Design a binder for this molecule. Sequence first.
Ligand SMILES: CCNC(=O)c1c[nH]nn1
Ligand SMILES: [Cl-]
Length: 115
Amino acid sequence: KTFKQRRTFEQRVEDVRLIREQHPTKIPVIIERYKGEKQLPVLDKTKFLVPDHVNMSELIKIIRRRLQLNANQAFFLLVNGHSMVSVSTPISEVYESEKDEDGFLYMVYASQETF
Ligand SMILES: CCNC(=O)c1c[nH]nn1
Ligand SMILES: [Cl-]
């Protein structure tokens, strides 16, 4: 079901190494809907290459546009299992401190802030 369940540790590590080689300015991001979630739709895909210069505030805007949300749908983005302290941080910095050991950056979204 989940990304980690679909691919082996070995496969996830190698895929991150291929993105390093072919798309060196990109952050490899896994974005998954909360398993509880009722209101928001699922994304068309799981794996995203995010320009390393955009901050978390712009990634939230990007994802809200990709889900085709409207002005008054709530949207909450967890990173590496927890709330973001700040949305102003560049994803390059966020990546260095929050990356998984497989080298992906894992995110989960919901309409409730209480996941
Ligand atoms: C099948 C739904 N597709 C989308 O909503 C989308 C957005 N960007 N690329 N695809
Ligand atoms: Cl690149």
